[PDB]
Design a protein around this ligand. Structure first.
Ligand SMILES: CCCCCCCCCCCCCC(=O)O
Ligand SMILES: CCCCCCCCCCCCCC(=O)O
Length: 219
């Protein structure tokens, strides 16, 4: 399993440093807990219709979670809530399509995407409950999460076969995207975020349904 020593759950310095040190092994996958490979992370296909853009990503991938930096862990035992702050440079790949408009430009494209995220900050809030399982050990059972984000340094857009390959229009569109990267991030990033959070919350939840609380915590 995991090469990390035991914390008080509300010792938030120990928890931050334990998350830090446990990450590479966790995101390499643990098949007998619930833990897939989380770098590269396979995202479920999704679709959205937002601010006039119709957007699909198929066989989506997220690379860079191996590389993430844990900023703070705040486990709160009265609230049975956990807050997790981190950041990373990520890449998001996959087969995309594009319909309708982005902001003031019309868009059509069916090809490949490579987004590069530079210093993306995440604020993950998880609520939980303590359950006993079948064999009378308690586990931390995650229930619900909120997530917020913040691409602080930069976002770049690579999109192949825009407007059926027509250079003029593709270049114009990609220049637009790349210049207003931050508005575009705030305008369309939430369902891309949701897509990874849905998988990340799921994987953690699996882990801790499998390991006894008495096993990884101070009682
Ligand atoms: C996005 C990366 C999150 C993956 C890490 C999941 C949390 C594992 C808990 C590690 C802390 C151990 C607690 C303890 O031993 O006291
Ligand atoms: C064509 C518009 C696509 C919208 C992408 C905007 C950039 C937002 C990145 C989303 C965050 C990725 C999730 C994560 O870092 O775990």
């Amino acid at each position: 399993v995991l090469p990390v020593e035991k914390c008080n759950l509300e010792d938030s310095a120990c928890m931050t440093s334990a998350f830090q040190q446990a990450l590479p092994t966790f995101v390499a996958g643990l098949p007998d807990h619930g833990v897939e490979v989380m770098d590269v992370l396979d995202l479920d296909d999704f679709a959205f219709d937002l601010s006039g853009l119709q957007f699909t990503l198929k066989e989506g991938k997220l690379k860079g979670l191996k590389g993430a930096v844990i900023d703070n862990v705040k486990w709160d035992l009265k609230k049975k809530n956990i807050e997790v702050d981190f950041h990373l440079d990520a890449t998001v790949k996959g087969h995309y399509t594009a319909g309708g408009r982005i902001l003031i430009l019309p868009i059509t494209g069916d090809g490949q995407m490579k987004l590069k995220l530079k210093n993306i900050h995440i604020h993950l809030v998880v609520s939980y409950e303590m359950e006993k399982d079948a064999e009378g050990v308690d586990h931390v059972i995650f229930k619900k999460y909120t997530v917020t984000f913040d691409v602080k340094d930069n976002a770049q857009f690579g999109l192949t076969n825009l407007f059926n390959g027509n250079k003029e229009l593709s270049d114009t569109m990609l220049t637009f995207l790349n210049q207003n990267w931050k508005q575009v991030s705030e305008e369309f990033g939430k369902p891309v975020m949701e897509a990874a959070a849905k998988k990340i919350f799921k994987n953690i939840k699996h882990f801790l349904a499998k390991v006894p609380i008495a096993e990884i915590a101070n009682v």
